[PDB]
Amino acid sequence: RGSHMASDKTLDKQLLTVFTDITCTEIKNNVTNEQIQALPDYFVRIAEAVRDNTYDKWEKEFRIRSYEPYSNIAEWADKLMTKKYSDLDNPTGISVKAGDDIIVLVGDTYGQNISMQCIWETGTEYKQTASSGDVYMLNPGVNKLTMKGEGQLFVMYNTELTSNTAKPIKIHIPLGSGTVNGFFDLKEHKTDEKYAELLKKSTHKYFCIRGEKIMFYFHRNKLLEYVPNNILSAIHLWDNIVGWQQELMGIDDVRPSQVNNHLFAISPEGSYMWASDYQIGFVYTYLGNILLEDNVMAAEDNAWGPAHQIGHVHQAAINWASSTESSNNLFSNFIIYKLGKYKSRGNGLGSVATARYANGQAWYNMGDATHQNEDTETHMRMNWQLWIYYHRCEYKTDFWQTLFKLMREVNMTEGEDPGKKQLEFAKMASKAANQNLTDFFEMWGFFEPVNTTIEQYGTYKYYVSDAMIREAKEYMAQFPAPKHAFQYIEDRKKSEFPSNDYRYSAVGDVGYYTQFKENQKITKAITAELAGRKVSIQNGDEAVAFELRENDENGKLLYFSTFTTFEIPSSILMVNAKLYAVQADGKRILL
Ligand SMILES: [Zn+2]
């Protein structure tokens, strides 16, 4: 009002004489009905509603909201070495049609820059919810947005969360601007009753459900088909699944304090299931196996499939080309374990003996001579043994969290140099355990030289030289000897499976995890009887494996088995070979 100041713009001057602030949610003291009626008609209707209490309560719950801040997704995908999470953390619950004019009244923004985004559909061969849409700049105060297209509105508020300007921003989308669809928020709305009511009153093709860690944005008519009246067990289940994967990654230091974005599940009208940057997807005809917990638990693969897909979002730090369809199964297997119904997936260690010692294979071509067709069933046991030993047997219950930390320090992309990355993984695993895991990684094929090109979502030079191998072994040798020969570990018993299940014959007779956990010792008088190439072990059930070694127990590994009866392959050289039993702690006993 001094001469030094520019006048306020015209509408701002008028609104701020009737209303407490530019959000127009409260009538200022001693304003008259005449002052209300001199407003533009659009704002008359709102002043009226705010003066009287005629704002439909349902409408108000979404038309007036304070939007909390969320972190930036590109920044955190880089720092955490993941695929990008969603930035659709902030639904408004308002839908629109092309040509709609939308008034958006933005309160104090504390210097933050925010926008509004309209999210609809994409696809050529079928349709799915898009990961982005029309973006509209927002400024503090009055905004009029004219919709280029239909969809639902999301507030885009992404910033540094620690800063004390990172506060919620109050935004009023008043009456007459678009359509209230609503959305369900777990913490705010709390109950299945509230969910059922919100869904009922919604009208849009899609309805948004916001959990703590994951969000659903699924076809309305499917939610009505499968879960008309309940969402809580569905949303808690998928929150837990995402949370359990996050647990292993050792990121509690930054989540939720600095990174808080959700994963965002859509329902494409095609494909099957997948995860990538910005969104994960479940074909809309499959949604019965997502939204009902009983369907999730009714078959092994109903939790496995989705867990696997989400694991792709999280694998990069510890993954490298050749492993891309197995390394995420650390997460799939952790989720099966957590849910408590089924046993772990993967081949048995016989597959690894066969690959390594019968066929001369290394990690990159383990069970795959083609170098482009990963034997995921064999590979997936590697990360999982590390979990079974350090976590399930409790020898180091923060092993994985530590290894993820170290691999994030290593900061190698999955594809830049996989031959080097496999060694960095072995070195960091040793560092994480504070143990020399040479024997483990030797068995798993990490110490064979490679010079070739593989294909796995791209062509990659795979190069592992003797010097790299020597450097890594020297590196790992600085740590104390491991307490157990847990390269022979299992978390499954033959009797847990039907006889035509692939695991029944695969898993072997010895090496079960309790033998490691109870530091079992071999006391009985083990003996071996050989006939041709066939080996039979008598009273050897206290062992965890049997080895064939050149010259003595410190010589090269020629073959191994976790069965008490096995054949030695034709290819193995027998002169100078000797046979041993392995007890859990790594003592070898001549047979
Ligand atoms: Zn996959």
Q: Say what angle helices 232-248 and 300-314 make with each other, to 10 degrees.
A: 50
Residues 291 and 321 in one domain: no
φ, ψ dihedrals at 199, nearest 5°:
-65, -40
Amino acid found at 19: F
Cβ atoms of 248 and 239 within 8 Å: the answer is: no
Q: 141: closest CA among 254, 252, 16? A: 16
Please identify, among 296, 323, 344, the residue that sits at the C-terminal boundary of a domain: 296
Please identify, among 438, 469, 488, the residue that sits at the C-terminal boundary of a domain: 488
Helix (H, G, I), strand (E, B) or coil at 334: helix
Distance CA 192, CA 195 (A): 5
306 Cα: distance to centroid of ligand 1 (angstroms): 10
Experimental method: X-ray
Any domain includes 514: no
Any domain includes 281: yes
CATH code assigned at 152: 2.60.120.1250
Cβ atoms of 175 and 45 within 8 Å: the answer is: yes
361 Cα: distance to centroid of ligand 1 (angstroms): 23
**Hey, what are 107's tokens?**
């309160």
Integer-rounded Cα Rg, in Å, for the chain is 30
Domain count, the chain: 4
284 Cα: distance to centroid of ligand 1 (angstroms): 19
Helix (H, G, I), strand (E, B) or coil at 333: helix
Distance CA 49, CA 45 (A): 6
Distance CA 412, CA 424 (A): 9
Residues 37 and 162 in one domain: no
**Hey, what are 1's tokens?**
């009002």
- Neighbouring-strand partners of residue 580: 547, 590
309 Cα: distance to centroid of ligand 1 (angstroms): 6
Any domain includes 292: yes
308 Cα: distance to centroid of ligand 1 (angstroms): 6
148 Cα: distance to centroid of ligand 1 (angstroms): 37
27 Cα: distance to centroid of ligand 1 (angstroms): 56
Residues 100 and 124 in one domain: yes
Helix (H, G, I), strand (E, B) or coil at 537: strand
275 Cα: distance to centroid of ligand 1 (angstroms): 9
358 Cα: distance to centroid of ligand 1 (angstroms): 28
CATH code assigned at 452: 1.10.390.30
583 Cα: distance to centroid of ligand 1 (angstroms): 36
Cα distances (angstroms) measured from residue 476 to each of 403, 428, 437, 438, 466: 14, 9, 7, 7, 15
325 Cα: distance to centroid of ligand 1 (angstroms): 5
Residues 422 and 478 in one domain: yes
346 Cα: distance to centroid of ligand 1 (angstroms): 14
Q: Which residues surround ligand 1, an ion (CB under 5 A)?
A: 325
Strand stretches in 332-458, DSSP E: 450-455
Strand stretches in 147-261, DSSP E: 151-156, 169-172, 179-180, 184-185, 206-210, 214-219
Q: 309: closest CA among 249, 343, 263, 256? A: 263
298 Cα: distance to centroid of ligand 1 (angstroms): 21
414 Cα: distance to centroid of ligand 1 (angstroms): 14
Residues 6+ apart with CB under 8 A from 470: none
Helix (H, G, I), strand (E, B) or coil at 184: strand
70 Cα: distance to centroid of ligand 1 (angstroms): 29
Within 10 Å of residue 391's Cβ, how many Cβ atoms?
19
Within 10 Å of residue 460's Cβ, how many Cβ atoms?
22
Residues 160 and 219 in one domain: yes
Any domain includes 573: yes
Q: 228: closest CA among 257, 204, 205, 196? A: 196
**Hey, what are 302's tokens?**
């109903």
Q: 224: closest CA among 241, 239, 240, 204? A: 204
Residue with tokens 């046979």: 579
Pairing of strands 527-531, 534-538: antiparallel
**Is the omega angle on the peptide bond into residue 480 within 30 degrees of 0, that is, cis?**
no
φ, ψ dihedrals at 217, nearest 5°:
-135, 80
Within 10 Å of residue 571's Cβ, how many Cβ atoms?
11
Residues 462 and 551 in one domain: no
- 50: enclosing H helix or E strand: helix 41-51
Cα distances (angstroms) measured from residue 348 to each of 21, 269, 376, 505: 68, 38, 12, 8
Helix (H, G, I), strand (E, B) or coil at 461: strand
458 Cα: distance to centroid of ligand 1 (angstroms): 15
Helix (H, G, I), strand (E, B) or coil at 124: coil
Any domain includes 302: no
119 Cα: distance to centroid of ligand 1 (angstroms): 27
Cβ atoms of 287 and 222 within 8 Å: the answer is: yes
Cβ atoms of 386 and 400 within 8 Å: the answer is: yes
367 Cα: distance to centroid of ligand 1 (angstroms): 18
282 Cα: distance to centroid of ligand 1 (angstroms): 14
Any domain includes 463: yes
Cα four-point dihedral sign 354, 359, 362, 364: negative
Q: 24-32 long-range CB contacts below 8 Å, 24 or more apart? A: 24/50, 24/105, 24/172, 24/174, 25/50, 25/64, 25/170, 25/172, 26/50, 27/51
Greatest distance between any 2 Cα atoms in the chain: 108
Residues 392 and 253 in one domain: no
Residues 291 and 350 in one domain: no
Q: 220: closest CA among 256, 194, 184? A: 184
Residues 6+ apart with CB under 8 A from 124: none
Pairing of strands 206-210, 184-185: parallel
281 Cα: distance to centroid of ligand 1 (angstroms): 13
Any domain includes 304: no
Residues 407 and 430 in one domain: yes
Distance CA 258, CA 69 (A): 11
DSSP alpha helix (H) spans, 368-417:
376-379, 381-387, 399-410
φ, ψ dihedrals at 186, nearest 5°:
-60, -50
Residue-number span of the structural domain to which 259 is assigned: 62-296
401 Cα: distance to centroid of ligand 1 (angstroms): 22
312 Cα: distance to centroid of ligand 1 (angstroms): 7
Distance CA 99, CA 283 (A): 30
Residues 41 and 88 in one domain: no
Distance CA 458, CA 455 (A): 5
Q: 324: closest CA among 399, 430, 418? A: 418
Amino acid found at 260: N
550 Cα: distance to centroid of ligand 1 (angstroms): 39
Helix (H, G, I), strand (E, B) or coil at 437: coil
Residues 6+ apart with CB under 8 A from 416: none
252 Cα: distance to centroid of ligand 1 (angstroms): 26
Cβ atoms of 517 and 394 within 8 Å: the answer is: yes
Residues 291 and 198 in one domain: yes
329 Cα: distance to centroid of ligand 1 (angstroms): 9
Running DSSP on this structure, what letter comes out for residue 512? B
Residues 333 and 418 in one domain: yes
Distance CA 90, CA 62 (A): 11
492 Cα: distance to centroid of ligand 1 (angstroms): 23
Helix (H, G, I), strand (E, B) or coil at 145: strand
Any domain includes 305: no
Please identify, among 261, 296, 331, the residue that sits at the C-terminal boundary of a domain: 296
571 Cα: distance to centroid of ligand 1 (angstroms): 34
